[PDB]
Amino acid sequence: SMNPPPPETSNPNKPKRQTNQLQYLLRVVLKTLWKHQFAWPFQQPVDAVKLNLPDYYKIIKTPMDMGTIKKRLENNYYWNAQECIQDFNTMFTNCYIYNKPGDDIVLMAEALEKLFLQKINELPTEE
């Protein structure tokens, strides 16, 4: 079965802001997770064809991944930090919902989520 259109990363109808929290989400949060040895399954939208997951998009209706988040941050898609934090949490939750609890990919998400939670705990105050 086919992949859906990816989540949007560009929309001139959507109002945008550049804020110090969003800057931190790129410079600290995304960068920390992206360079991790376990980042690779999360660096692009789930490719149900390549990965032979024909039911993935039957089950997962709000897909999200760090490639999309990276584009949203680099291309100033967000208004606030909570939108971006929600995207990360959607990505993790999708992984835990779709995959079996003993899968390596769940351990990988868990390790990335541990770092995410630490960095979000230190989210800078709004300027």
Curated annotation (Swiss-Prot):
The record marks 99 as: Acetylated histone binding. It comes from the Eukaryota. There is a cross-link at residue 58 (Glycyl lysine isopeptide (Lys-Gly) (interchain with G-Cter in SUMO2)). Ubiquitously expressed. Residues 17-123 form the Bromo domain. JQ1, a thieno-triazolo-1,4-diazepine derivative, and I-BET, a benzodiazepine derivative, have been tested on tumors with success. Treatment with GSK1210151A (I-BET151, a I-BET derivative) has strong effets on mixed lineage leukemia and promotes myeloid differentiation and leukemia stem-cell depletion. Interacts with p53/TP53; the interaction is direct. Interacts (via CTD region) with CDK9 and CCNT1, acting as an associated component of P-TEFb complex. Interacts with RELA (when acetylated at 'Lys-310'). Interacts (via NET domain) with NSD3, CHD4, BICRA and ATAD5. The interaction with BICRA bridges BRD4 to the GBAF complex. Interacts (via NET domain) with JMJD6 (via JmjC and N-terminal domains); the interaction is stronger in presence of ssRNA and recruits JMJD6 on distal enhancers. Interacts with NSD3. Interacts with NIPBL. (Microbial infection) Interacts with bovine papillomavirus type 1 regulatory protein E2. This interactions may serve for the tethering of viral genomes to host mitotic chromosomes allowing successful partitioning of the viral genome during cell division. The NET domain mediates interaction with a number of chromatin proteins involved in transcription regulation (NSD3, JMJD6, CHD4, GLTSCR1 and ATAD5). Belongs to the BET family. It is linked to Cornelia de Lange syndrome 6: A form of Cornelia de Lange syndrome, a clinically heterogeneous developmental disorder associated with malformations affecting multiple systems. It is characterized by facial dysmorphisms, abnormal hands and feet, growth delay, cognitive retardation, hirsutism, gastroesophageal dysfunction and cardiac, ophthalmologic and genitourinary anomalies. CDLS6 inheritance is autosomal dominant. This is Bromodomain-containing protein 4. It comes from Homo sapiens (Human).
